Structure formats: structure tokens, C-alpha cells
Symmetry: C4
Subunit: 82 residues, 4 copies
């Protein structure tokens, strides 16, 4: 699958996660972007997490749509620097 | 392995994790479902976690039965949206 | 690699992690076993973590020796139930 | 890819992560090395995490550059002890 397509897909995931957390959980755009990366990479520090039922549902959706996409993106990126 | 079979398997994991956490740790059904996804995806925020020995044992079982199943499910889902 | 050999390897990792955490960080055997699974599975709730320099070094060693071993063990287990 | 090259790459990631956390977030060299492993392995206990915008940005960079590199390094190490 073309590396550039995978890039657009992960970017779309990042936008989805970031806007969602910002609007549902009320954290700043910067914190929301950070939380999105920490979540889809499966790091999960837990310094930020959803505190509402809608936020919990949303986070589950992001986990399902985002973890795989991020994993493929990382691996494709490996190919280019390595 | 047929994607729909993997779907049923991950659904069964999700039911197992959610009912187990709800009954053993006493959190709500919604929190327990959320915790199940957060656990089997290996995110592990830690906003929720078991506080009893039985809950700890149970969580180890869920980790072993669930992490692989979820990974395969994510990868199969990748195939279909992509 | 024979599935049973992988089983022995992950059991050895679990023993190493559990005894190490118990003796270095002073948590109970049960908590230490749970923490070991939570760590080598990469869940990392953070309800338990090392608070000493030796514990931090030890945890890095467990991460390096344990995460791959657990990953291979999970995948092999998948094959037998699936 | 030669295992020793992968070794150098992960060592470089570890240096990057450790110095970055130490200087941006102000934690000790030891805590910063520990946090780097905990992050690039995707464990993410959350006992340590960035509390500044620059730290958050930096952590996202380390996640992208480090998680893949660490995964390949673990897998190569598997080959040699096994
Ligand atoms: K993880
Ligand atoms: K994690
Ligand atoms: K975590
Ligand atoms: K955590």
C-alpha cells in the first residue's frame, strides 16, 4: 500500500482523535493532539483520559480505528529512514 | 481465518472482560466496557484498574486471552476499510 | 520454535519479573505477579511502578527481555485456541 | 538489516529520548532513561510524563521515531538469545 496513502490515513486519524477529545473532554488543542498520539501508539500514560460516557465511547472508537493505522504508518516510516 | 470468525472471537473477549470487571471490581457496565478496550488494546491509562486479588488474577487472564485476539481483529479490520 | 519451549521462556520471564519486583520494590507476591503481566504485555496501568533506581533499572531489563517473549507466546497461544 | 545496525539505531533513540526528557522536563538522567524505555516500549506507566507543551511535542516525536525502532530491536534480540 503506497506509503503516502498510509500517511494521509494516519493524519486523518490524528485529526479525528484530536478534535474529538478537544470537543468532548474539553482539553486544549495541544493536549488533545498529545493525548491522541499517546493513545493510538498504545502508550497510555493516563495523565489525560476521558471522564464522560461519550468520551469513553469515542476513545474506544479511536482505539479501534487508530491503533492499526498508526502501527502500519510507523512500519512504513521505518522503511524510509532505515 | 475468516474475518467474521475473528469478529465473534473479539466480541466474546469484550463480553468476558466487561462482565468480569463489572462483577469483580464493581464498576459500571460502561466503565467496564471502556476499561476492557483500554486493556486489550494495551493502552492501559490506569484511570481504572483492579484493586482486589481476584481482579488482578482476572486481569491477567484477560491480558493473555484478549491482547492477541484484539491485535488480529484490528489487522483484519485494516484490510476492509483499506 | 516449539510452542512448549516458548511457554517455558515466558514462564521464566514471569518468575524473573515477579521475584525482582517483590524483592526490589517490596510489593506482595500477588501484586508483583500482576505488575509483571501488566508490564510485559505493555499495558502499564501505572498503579504499580518502581520507585527506586535499582527498580527502574530492573524494569528496563524486564521490558527488554520480556515484551518480545510475551508477544511470541501470545501469538503461539492464538494458534492453539484458534 | 544487520542486527548491530538496529542496535545502534535503538541506542541513538535512547540517547535522544533521555537527553530530551532531562532537559525539557527537568527530571534526573536516571528517571529520564527509565521514562524513555517505558515510552518507546509502549508501557506508559504515567508515573512520569511531560508537563510542558514542548515536552508534549517532543514526546510525540519520540513516540514516532522510537516505537518502531524498539520493536525491531526487540525482535532481533529475540533471534539471538533464542
Ligand atoms: K502498549
Ligand atoms: K500502554
Ligand atoms: K499505560
Ligand atoms: K498509565
Amino acid at each position: 500500500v503506497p506509503a503516502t496513502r498510509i500517511l494521509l490515513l494516519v493524519l486523518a486519524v490524528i485529526i479525528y482523535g484530536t478534535a474529538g477529545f478537544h470537543f468532548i473532554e474539553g482539553e486544549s488543542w495541544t493536549v488533545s493532539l498529545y493525548w491522541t498520539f499517546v493513545t493510538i501508539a498504545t502508550v497510555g500514560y493516563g495523565d489525560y483520559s476521558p471522564h464522560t460516557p461519550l468520551g469513553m465511547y469515542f476513545t474506544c472508537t479511536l482505539i479501534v480505528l487508530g491503533i492499526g493505522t498508526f502501527a502500519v504508518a510507523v512500519e512504513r516510516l521505518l522503511e524510509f529512514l532505515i
